[PDB]
Amino acid sequence: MELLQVLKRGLQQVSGHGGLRGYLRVLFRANDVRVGTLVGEDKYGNKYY
Amino acid sequence: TYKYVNLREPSMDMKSVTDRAAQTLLWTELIRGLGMTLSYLFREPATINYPFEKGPLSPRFRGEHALRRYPSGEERCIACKLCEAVCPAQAITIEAEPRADGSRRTTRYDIDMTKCIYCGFCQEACPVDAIVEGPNFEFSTETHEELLYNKEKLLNNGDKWEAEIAANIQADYLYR
Amino acid sequence: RGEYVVAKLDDLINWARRSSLWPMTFGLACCAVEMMHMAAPRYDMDRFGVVFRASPRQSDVMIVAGTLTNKMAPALRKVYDQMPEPRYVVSMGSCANGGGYYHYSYSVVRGCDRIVPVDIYVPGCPPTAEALLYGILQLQKKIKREKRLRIWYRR
Amino acid sequence: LHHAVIPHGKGGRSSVSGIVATVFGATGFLGRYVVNHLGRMGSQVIVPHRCEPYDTMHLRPMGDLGQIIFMDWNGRDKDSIRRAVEHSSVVINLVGREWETQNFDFEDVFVKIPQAIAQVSKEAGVEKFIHISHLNADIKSSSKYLRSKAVGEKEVRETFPEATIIKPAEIFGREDRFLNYFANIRWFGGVPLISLGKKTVKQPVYIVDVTKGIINAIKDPDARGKTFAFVGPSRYLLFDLVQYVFAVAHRPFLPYPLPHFAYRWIGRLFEISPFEPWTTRDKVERIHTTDKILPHLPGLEDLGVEATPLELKAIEVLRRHRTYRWLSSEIEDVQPAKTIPT
Amino acid sequence: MFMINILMLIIPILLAVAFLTLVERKVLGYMQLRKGPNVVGPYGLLQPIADAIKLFIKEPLRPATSSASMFILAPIMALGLALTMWIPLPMPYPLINMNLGVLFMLAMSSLAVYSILWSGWASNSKYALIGALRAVAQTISYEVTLAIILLSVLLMSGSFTLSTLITTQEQMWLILPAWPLAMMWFISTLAETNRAPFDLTEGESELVSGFNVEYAAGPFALFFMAEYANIIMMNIFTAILFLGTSHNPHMPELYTINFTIKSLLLTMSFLWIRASYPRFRYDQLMHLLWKNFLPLTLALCMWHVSLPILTSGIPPQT
Amino acid sequence: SKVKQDMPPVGGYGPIDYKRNLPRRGLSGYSMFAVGIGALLFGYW
Ligand SMILES: NC(=O)C1=CN([C@@H]2O[C@H](COP(=O)(O)OP(=O)(O)OC[C@H]3O[C@@H](n4cnc5c(N)ncnc54)[C@H](OP(=O)(O)O)[C@@H]3O)[C@@H](O)[C@H]2O)C=CC1
Ligand code: SF4
Ligand code: SF4
Ligand code: SF4
């Protein structure tokens, strides 16, 4: 049932950020809690998804 | 040819008449409008998450100016004053003299970024690809005096954005 | 130290003001088109708290977008003076900045900062809607650095 | 005054007037007119400020590109003074307060600060210096404001012998505390006056005249090492002057006599304000302090400035205080106040 | 324990009004393919708090041409009467159980119109005056029709008591027997509460801001709070008249749940409509009611005086 | 090499709809009134 998959993708976003503290860091810093495939990082600590 | 947009005559039979009466009294045609907005409520918005997400651009974009160098490090500009002679807004000021080693080089190269119309003519008129417009479009200042660029500020920009300017010129010079 | 407490009241009022900027419905020329596109769905300025209002008395920011002419100069100052303080001015585009393509004309004010005090200057002709949004987000950072209550305390 | 300090142009916004000016206290009432005139003629003005930068925005349209410069300074910091005056050919001091805050007394602001500014200016080789004293300043006053004004007037002369001390009377203008002060007494019904204002004489001067006088001092080499008394053309009894203010504003005038000692007690009450006090014991003293008559000091006329009558330029200040019923009243509608002849 | 009850009424109401601003902005945002406030706090939940503080630390200014005493009375009169409309509302127990509650709400609604007339007149501006006299015109349009629609409904409830509307609808909603009146009542509340397509007194696109173009800072905030308190209050009124919930004396909480949900959906419809239609013209708003609603409302008023008699369905007087 | 330019596909681009398309919806006038009147009678009873 697609409707249950929606919840699972919602929960995989908590575990995708390394836990609850990581989930809230991106929620407040970026107002967006999606999970992407890390393309890479630069010398200043910026991460690219 | 042509076509009439609002040249119609309603059907006056009883069923067609009653359909219009039912629409008038029951507001049916005002409820299609509510259907249209309701569909949009359950669509995904087209918004991006600025500044974490940026709108797409292209190699031809015309942003902040810069002055380039050769791979050696010598300046490309040889003070020909073609960019100055074509600037529609007269935003470029240039002076030149023979350098210590006798090279035709500029002593002054100013761009008034509040007079520039970001038209790109200066880089079209440059025969050595010295003046370009980088891809940067986020250089808002806090004082009017910060937008008057001199040769030091422009040379700094080239050294700051060179890695990207070269990539865009490589991907676009075959159209020029 | 009592200076700490006021330094935390400053954060509150500064946060309330940068979080609820209300620009005036004031555009002049082509730049005002790119100001509409900042209200369009892609950038949706309203999601930063930025909401246009028509009345000068209900506005916090004037976004001078376009050319200012000698015939229009008295009108711009009036609506600015009618904005309650604190008030901020953003100069969008090159006509509003230093005259732009019409600097040397006879009917154009060379720079909107001759008529009003300006905080942020946005370069471009027109500045992309994304460029203007950078200007507004830079204005919020300028309001976050205000220390009105920490300066009153030390008087 | 080398090649870069020679005038050019025709004295406009984009002209070079060969003046480099540091104005302390440029965010005050008198500051915004000195800066306005200096920038009108194309002068490089340095503006050290103590307040929030937002409180200087009004000064930005007053000067051409790159002409008005802002610096963060501190009255008690000797280095910040030097960083701001070291390049100036003239320093103009306008620092002052009408009340004593928890951090600055009248001796801090009218003795210790002006002396420090003058000292560092001389150490930096500043050619000209201008100090704004008060007309009524004297050692034997009952007001700390005027007493400290007298000590400062004496320290500056010692530190900077070539300074041009200026002694304005009460100054009236749009943002004054002189005509707006009386007009705002209406909030309390009556208009208390010590002795009913029949034994106090005032000779106010217009704001622009003080400014035009200051600018003429800068350019006039004969004003070096001299003292001036800027004053209006006419002397009015305080009662007749305050009666005029309520006449122009078209407000009911209900003066009553209040004893000097009781007036101070009220002055003690308002001082509890942690903000700009509405009135203070010190301010009451100044209000009822008769304006001096100094016939030996040079005045405005010696600087080429014609004193502006109060009647001509009083409506512009007080039209704001009238109700809608009387906004459209004209200048001629009120007969001028009674003057004290010489 | 009565003063505690009043505070327990007005204080939540202000909070609901504050967050209705967020809901409208976020709802209109998604119908418009935007996202609405989402940056100020998680999902914008702090957006109302930022706006409220910003307004009250701003500078209020009285225009030079204003009438001071009336200019300040209007916002006080506006918000005070907005919170007054709530005291007799059964939810399921009213704070003040008025025997003539329906008349009381009618009268207070009329009195609240003068907070618009006096604000626009005291401003002493032409856009402020044009908006003031669009409220005179707008009230002349719906006041008579809205009163008669209530009378028609009350001919099936039996009394003006608001709590009796609950008893009347213990077997079935009043929208079924009276759906034609509900349609004309819903549009009347749109017009009465000055809402699009009937938000003519303010008229941003035509009068800059209407009667309140001269109001800023806190004084403006009181008008904004008053306007939204009416939006919630009238939709609570609509739910009680036509969508009457069932009351269980032992579990009054269940009523407040069903009652609140119905009032929310009716309130979302107000936002939904504002994002769907253009604006009437203030002379057409008058012809809509006098030439379409009034002829039909008078006919239905007759039908509801005769229907109970010819069917022996007259309700009890008490 | 040959000349490479931004050109359409060999067979051309597919069709593009451009005419108005407002589908007919809903029941006729008579049916909408029957349900309207029908509800009243039940409501009255
Ligand atoms: N009626 C009059 O106005 C008279 C004027 N004068 C004198 O003219 C001078 C200025 O005129 P006026 O406009 O009336 O004064 P204002 O009160 O209007 O302004 C005072 C200026 O001095 C600054 N100031 C005060 N204290 C300090 C301090 N510790 N550190 C730094 N700056 C300080 C203020 O800076 P900020 O507020 O930004 O912190 C402000 O810019 C005063 O010395 C006054 O005594 C003499 C005769 C009459
Ligand atoms: S982009 Fe156009 S206006 Fe700008 S400097 Fe180049 S030529 Fe001049
Ligand atoms: S056109 Fe190019 S080479 Fe010539 S002056 Fe301009 S930047 Fe230099
Ligand atoms: S700055 Fe550019 S876009 Fe803006 S008004 Fe001028 S020419 Fe038009």
**Length of chain D in terms of residues written:** 342
**Length of chain E in terms of residues written:** 318
Residues in binding site of B for [4Fe-4S] cluster: 77, 80, 83, 87, 116, 119, 122, 126
Question: Quick one: which ligand is closest to D283's CA?
Answer: 1
Strand ranges, E, within B22-161: 65-67, 92-98, 104-112, 131-133, 148-149
What is chain A's Cα-based Rg?
A: 13
Alpha carbon distances (Å) from D94 to B10, D27, D113, E244, E287: 83, 9, 11, 73, 68
Q: B94: which strand partners?
A: B109
**Length of chain C in terms of residues written:** 155
Structure-block tokens of residue D70: 């802002």
User: Which residue is closest in CA terms to ligand 2's atom 2?
Assistant: B119
Report cis status (omega within 30 of 0) of the bond before E92: yes
Alpha carbons E91 and E94: distance in angstroms, whole number: 6
Q: Which of D241, D125, D221, D120 is nearest to D172 (CA)?
A: D241
Phi and psi at E223, nearest 5°, equal -65, -45
C63 φψ region: left (φ > 0), alpha (ψ -120 to 50), beta (else): beta
Phi and psi at D253, nearest 5°, equal -115, 115
D18 φψ region: left (φ > 0), alpha (ψ -120 to 50), beta (else): left
Structural domain count of chain D:
1
The CA-based angle D237-D239-D242, given to 5 degrees, is 105
D236-237/D201-202 β-pairing: antiparallel
Alpha carbons B66 and B162: distance in angstroms, whole number: 9
Residues B144, D65: contact at Cβ < 8 Å? yes
Contacts with C, D 91-110, CB within 8 Å: 101, 103-104
**CA closest to C10 among chain E residues:** E57
Q: Which residues of E touch D324 (CB under 8 A)?
A: 64-67, 124
Who contacts D303 (Cβ-Cβ below 8 Å, separation ≥6)? D212, D213, D216, D217, D220, D223, D228
**Probe target for ligand 2 pocket from B62, B81, B113, B117, with the most ligand atoms within 8 Å of CB:** B117
Alpha carbons E67 and E121: distance in angstroms, whole number: 8
Structure-block tokens of residue E45: 């939940």
Closest atom of ligand 2 to CA, residue C101: 3
The CA-based angle E269-E270-E276, given to 5 degrees, is 85
Q: C88: which strand partners?
A: C61
Find the helix or strand (DSSP H, E) in which F31 lies.
helix F29-44
Alpha carbon distances (Å) from E72 to D7, D139, E69, E80, E130: 56, 50, 6, 13, 19
Distance between Cα B146 and ligand 1 center (Å): 31
Residue whose pair of structure tokens reads 């038209």 in the numeric block: B119
Q: C92: which strand partners?
A: C65, C122
Q: Which of C122, D61, C34, C105 is nearest to B147 (CA)?
A: C122
Q: Which residues of D touch B148 (CB under 8 A)?
A: 65
* Three-class SS state of D43: coil
The CA-based angle D79-D17-D40, given to 5 degrees, is 90
**Probe target for ligand 4 pocket from C68, C101, C110, with the most ligand atoms within 8 Å of CB:** C101
Residues of B with CB under 8 A from a CB of E: 27, 30, 33-34, 36-38, 40-41, 43, 45-47
Alpha carbons C62 and C22: distance in angstroms, whole number: 9
Q: Interhelix angle for D78-85 vs D113-123, to 10°?
A: 50
Report cis status (omega within 30 of 0) of the bond before C86: yes
Residues E179, F40: contact at Cβ < 8 Å? yes
Expressed in angstroms, the distance from the first to the final Cα of chain D is 45
State the structure-solving technique: cryo-EM
**Length of chain B in terms of residues written:** 176
Q: Interhelix angle for C3-18 vs E47-56, to 10°?
A: 110
Alpha carbons D92 and D88: distance in angstroms, whole number: 10
Does the beta carbon of C27 lie inside 6 Å of ligand 4? Answer: no
Alpha carbons B70 and B78: distance in angstroms, whole number: 12
Alpha carbons E231 and E209: distance in angstroms, whole number: 19
List of long-range contacts for E85-88, beta carbons under 8 Å, 24+ apart: E85/E109, E85/E112, E85/E229, E85/E230, E85/E233, E86/E9, E86/E10, E86/E13, E86/E229, E86/E233, E87/E9, E88/E162
E124 φψ region: left (φ > 0), alpha (ψ -120 to 50), beta (else): left
Structure-block tokens of residue E266: 């009716």
Residues C45, B50: contact at Cβ < 8 Å? no
Alpha carbons D252 and E72: distance in angstroms, whole number: 23
Alpha carbons E238 and E150: distance in angstroms, whole number: 11
Q: Which residues of E touch B27 (CB under 8 A)?
A: 183
Structure-block tokens of residue D77: 């910091």
Residues D72, D80: contact at Cβ < 8 Å? yes
Alpha carbons A29 and C137: distance in angstroms, whole number: 15
Who contacts C75 (Cβ-Cβ below 8 Å, separation ≥6)? none
Q: Which residues of E touch B33 (CB under 8 A)?
A: 276-277
Q: Interhelix angle for E47-56 vs E217-242, to 10°?
A: 130
Question: Quick one: which ligand is closest to C92's CA?
Answer: 4
Alpha carbons D22 and B54: distance in angstroms, whole number: 45
* Three-class SS state of D171: strand
Count CB neighbours of D258 within 10 A: 17
Residues C95, C67: contact at Cβ < 8 Å? yes
* Three-class SS state of D52: coil
For B80, counting Cβ atoms within 10 Å of its Cβ (0-12 exposed, 13-18 middle, 19+ buried), the class is middle
Alpha carbons E263 and B105: distance in angstroms, whole number: 76
> Containing domain of residue D104, as a range?
1-341
Distance between Cα B110 and ligand 2 center (Å): 12
> For B19, which DSSP code?
H
For B1-150, where are the alpha helices, taking DSSP H only?
A: 14-26, 28-41, 82-86, 121-125
Torsion angle defined by CA atoms of residues D319, D323, D324 and D326, in that order, rounded to the nearest 10 degrees: -60
Count CB neighbours of D305 within 10 A: 21
Does the beta carbon of D31 lie inside 6 Å of ligand 1? Answer: yes
Q: Which of E207, E208, E188, E206 is nearest to E198 (CA)?
A: E188
Q: Which of C15, C19, C5, C16 is nearest to C150 (CA)?
A: C5
